[PDB]
Amino acid sequence: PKEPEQLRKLFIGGLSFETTDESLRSHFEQWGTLTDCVVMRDPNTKRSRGFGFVTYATVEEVDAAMNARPHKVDGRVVEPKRAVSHLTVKKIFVGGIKEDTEEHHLRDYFEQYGKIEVIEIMTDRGSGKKRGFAFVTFDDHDSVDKIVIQKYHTVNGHNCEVRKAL
Numbered sequence: 001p002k003e004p005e006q007l008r009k010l011f012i013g014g015l016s017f018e019t020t021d022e023s024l025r026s027h028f029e030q031w032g033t034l035t036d037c038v039v040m041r042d043p044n045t046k047r048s049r050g051f052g053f054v055t056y057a058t059v060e061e062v063d064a065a066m067n068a069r070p071h072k073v074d075g076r077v078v079e080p081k082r083a084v085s086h087l088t089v090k091k092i093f094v095g096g097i098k099e100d101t102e103e104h105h106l107r108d109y110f111e112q113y114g115k116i117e118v119i120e121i122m123t124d125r126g127s128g129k130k131r132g133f134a135f136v137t138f139d140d141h142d143s144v145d146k147i148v149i150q151k152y153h154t155v156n157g158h159n160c161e162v163r164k165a166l
Protein backbone atom coordinates (compact mmCIF):
# COMPACT_ATOMS: atom_id res chain seq x y z
CA PRO A 1 0.00 0.00 0.00
CA LYS A 2 0.97 3.62 0.60
CA GLU A 3 4.00 4.74 2.60
CA PRO A 4 3.07 6.40 5.92
CA GLU A 5 2.05 9.99 5.33
CA GLN A 6 4.63 11.26 7.82
CA LEU A 7 7.39 10.00 5.52
CA ARG A 8 5.84 11.80 2.52
CA LYS A 9 5.86 15.30 4.03
CA LEU A 10 8.33 18.11 3.57
CA PHE A 11 8.35 20.89 6.11
CA ILE A 12 9.30 24.08 4.26
CA GLY A 13 10.89 26.89 6.27
CA GLY A 14 11.97 30.33 5.17
CA LEU A 15 8.97 31.10 2.99
CA SER A 16 8.29 34.50 1.57
CA PHE A 17 5.34 35.91 3.49
CA GLU A 18 3.68 36.33 0.09
CA THR A 19 3.71 32.58 -0.61
CA THR A 20 0.21 31.05 -0.57
CA ASP A 21 -1.15 27.50 -0.51
CA GLU A 22 -1.61 27.88 -4.25
CA SER A 23 1.86 29.22 -5.09
CA LEU A 24 3.58 26.70 -2.83
CA ARG A 25 1.60 23.95 -4.57
CA SER A 26 2.37 25.17 -8.09
CA HIS A 27 6.06 25.17 -7.23
CA PHE A 28 6.31 21.77 -5.54
CA GLU A 29 4.01 19.97 -7.98
CA GLN A 30 6.95 20.02 -10.38
CA TRP A 31 8.35 16.98 -8.50
CA GLY A 32 5.24 14.94 -7.80
CA THR A 33 1.58 14.72 -6.91
CA LEU A 34 0.75 16.79 -3.81
CA THR A 35 -1.98 15.35 -1.60
CA ASP A 36 -1.65 18.33 0.79
CA CYS A 37 -0.02 21.76 0.73
CA VAL A 38 -0.42 24.35 3.50
CA VAL A 39 1.11 27.73 4.38
CA MET A 40 0.93 28.27 8.12
CA ARG A 41 -0.72 31.57 9.05
CA ASP A 42 -1.57 33.54 12.15
CA PRO A 43 -5.16 32.71 13.20
CA ASN A 44 -6.08 36.38 13.76
CA THR A 45 -4.15 38.42 11.20
CA LYS A 46 -3.85 35.75 8.47
CA ARG A 47 -0.25 36.93 8.03
CA SER A 48 2.06 34.09 7.01
CA ARG A 49 4.18 32.48 9.70
CA GLY A 50 6.88 31.97 7.05
CA PHE A 51 6.69 28.18 6.92
CA GLY A 52 4.42 25.42 5.69
CA PHE A 53 4.40 21.86 4.52
CA VAL A 54 3.62 19.76 1.48
CA THR A 55 2.68 16.09 1.29
CA TYR A 56 3.64 14.02 -1.75
CA ALA A 57 1.94 10.84 -2.90
CA THR A 58 5.17 8.81 -2.59
CA VAL A 59 8.56 8.85 -0.91
CA GLU A 60 10.27 8.83 -4.32
CA GLU A 61 8.58 12.18 -4.98
CA VAL A 62 9.97 13.55 -1.70
CA ASP A 63 13.39 12.40 -2.89
CA ALA A 64 12.91 14.14 -6.24
CA ALA A 65 11.96 17.40 -4.55
CA MET A 66 14.89 17.22 -2.18
CA ASN A 67 17.27 16.44 -5.07
CA ALA A 68 16.01 19.59 -6.85
CA ARG A 69 17.18 21.92 -4.09
CA PRO A 70 17.89 24.77 -3.85
CA HIS A 71 14.26 25.78 -4.21
CA LYS A 72 13.50 29.43 -4.91
CA VAL A 73 9.79 29.86 -4.20
CA ASP A 74 8.23 33.24 -4.99
CA GLY A 75 11.68 34.80 -5.13
CA ARG A 76 13.12 33.40 -1.88
CA VAL A 77 15.31 30.34 -1.29
CA VAL A 78 13.39 28.11 1.12
CA GLU A 79 14.51 25.31 3.46
CA PRO A 80 12.74 21.97 2.96
CA LYS A 81 13.29 19.19 5.47
CA ARG A 82 11.68 15.78 5.88
CA ALA A 83 10.46 14.25 9.16
CA VAL A 84 12.64 11.94 11.27
CA SER A 85 11.41 10.00 14.38
CA HIS A 86 14.35 18.49 13.50
CA LEU A 87 17.91 17.69 14.60
CA THR A 88 19.63 18.85 11.42
CA VAL A 89 23.03 17.15 11.18
CA LYS A 90 25.33 15.82 8.48
CA LYS A 91 27.05 13.01 10.39
CA ILE A 92 26.02 9.50 11.42
CA PHE A 93 27.27 6.93 13.87
CA VAL A 94 27.41 3.43 12.36
CA GLY A 95 27.70 0.65 14.91
CA GLY A 96 27.96 -3.12 14.75
CA ILE A 97 30.44 -3.29 11.86
CA LYS A 98 32.89 -5.48 13.81
CA GLU A 99 36.56 -5.85 12.76
CA ASP A 100 36.26 -6.83 9.08
CA THR A 101 34.40 -3.77 7.77
CA GLU A 102 36.53 -1.40 5.69
CA GLU A 103 36.12 2.07 4.22
CA HIS A 104 35.00 0.85 0.80
CA HIS A 105 32.16 -1.18 2.36
CA LEU A 106 30.81 1.93 4.07
CA ARG A 107 31.42 4.15 1.05
CA ASP A 108 29.76 1.88 -1.53
CA TYR A 109 26.63 1.63 0.61
CA PHE A 110 26.31 5.12 2.06
CA GLU A 111 27.26 7.01 -1.13
CA GLN A 112 23.80 6.09 -2.47
CA TYR A 113 22.24 8.23 0.29
CA GLY A 114 24.36 11.31 -0.37
CA LYS A 115 27.76 12.74 -1.10
CA ILE A 116 30.29 11.54 1.47
CA GLU A 117 32.97 13.89 2.78
CA VAL A 118 34.51 11.86 5.65
CA ILE A 119 34.57 8.22 6.69
CA GLU A 120 36.15 7.57 10.08
CA ILE A 121 36.55 3.91 11.10
CA MET A 122 37.18 3.99 14.82
CA THR A 123 40.25 2.27 16.26
CA ASP A 124 41.44 1.68 19.79
CA ARG A 125 43.65 4.50 21.08
CA GLY A 126 46.03 2.00 22.70
CA SER A 127 46.15 -1.03 20.40
CA GLY A 128 45.04 0.27 17.01
CA LYS A 129 42.44 -2.49 16.72
CA LYS A 130 39.13 -1.67 15.10
CA ARG A 131 36.42 -0.96 17.65
CA GLY A 132 33.46 -1.94 15.48
CA PHE A 133 31.94 1.46 14.75
CA ALA A 134 32.45 4.35 12.37
CA PHE A 135 31.29 7.86 11.57
CA VAL A 136 30.23 9.04 8.12
CA THR A 137 29.94 12.75 7.30
CA PHE A 138 27.91 13.89 4.29
CA ASP A 139 27.72 17.22 2.52
CA ASP A 140 24.07 17.72 3.45
CA HIS A 141 21.54 16.69 6.08
CA ASP A 142 18.98 15.00 3.82
CA SER A 143 21.26 11.97 3.40
CA VAL A 144 21.26 11.51 7.18
CA ASP A 145 17.49 12.02 7.39
CA LYS A 146 16.87 9.32 4.79
CA ILE A 147 19.29 6.98 6.56
CA VAL A 148 17.87 7.22 10.07
CA ILE A 149 14.27 6.56 9.02
CA GLN A 150 15.13 3.14 7.57
CA LYS A 151 14.36 0.21 9.87
CA TYR A 152 17.49 -1.68 8.74
CA HIS A 153 21.00 -1.11 7.43
CA THR A 154 23.06 -4.01 6.07
CA VAL A 155 26.74 -3.32 5.39
CA ASN A 156 29.34 -6.01 4.72
CA GLY A 157 26.79 -8.61 5.81
CA HIS A 158 26.34 -6.96 9.23
CA ASN A 159 23.04 -5.64 10.60
CA CYS A 160 24.11 -2.14 11.67
CA GLU A 161 22.88 0.41 14.20
CA VAL A 162 22.81 3.89 12.66
CA ARG A 163 22.01 7.14 14.45
CA LYS A 164 22.55 10.86 14.06
CA ALA A 165 25.92 11.95 15.50
CA LEU A 166 26.52 15.13 17.57
Ligand SMILES: CCNC(=O)Nc1cc(C)on1
Binds near residue numbers: 011014038040052086
Ligand atom coordinates in the same frame (compact mmCIF):
# COMPACT_ATOMS: atom_id res chain seq x y z
C1 LIG B 1 9.65 24.86 9.34
C2 LIG B 1 8.97 23.71 8.67
N1 LIG B 1 7.92 23.17 9.52
C3 LIG B 1 8.21 22.43 10.68
O1 LIG B 1 9.34 22.21 11.08
N2 LIG B 1 7.10 21.93 11.39
C4 LIG B 1 5.76 22.04 11.06
C5 LIG B 1 5.07 22.64 9.94
C6 LIG B 1 3.77 22.40 10.23
C7 LIG B 1 2.53 22.71 9.58
O2 LIG B 1 3.65 21.73 11.40
N3 LIG B 1 4.84 21.50 11.91
